Amino acid sequence: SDKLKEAETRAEFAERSVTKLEKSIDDLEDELYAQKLKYKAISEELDHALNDMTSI
């Protein structure tokens, strides 16, 4: 009884923790993608500038 109470309790903590972890993971990944897309927009600004520089 002690063993299974312990196991279920720590398992519930594990489930809540892992779900919080998944929210964290998604937020981090989406923020990373947003930042990377901003960077690529900046890169295409630079690439338009380079196309101008094709003047040389």
Binding site: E22, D26, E29, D30, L32, Y33, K36, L37, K40, S43, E44, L46, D47, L50, M53, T54
Partner: peptide, 29 residues
């Protein structure tokens, strides 16, 4: 100029496509 062209081509489009792919996988998760 050649280095910049090849680096931009290798980097930007592949990164945006890969991020979209990872986003779709994230939505499925």
């Amino acid at each position: 100029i050649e280095a910049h062209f090849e680096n931009r081509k290798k980097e930007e489009e592949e990164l945006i496509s890969l991020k979209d792919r990872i986003e779709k996988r994230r939505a499925e998760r």
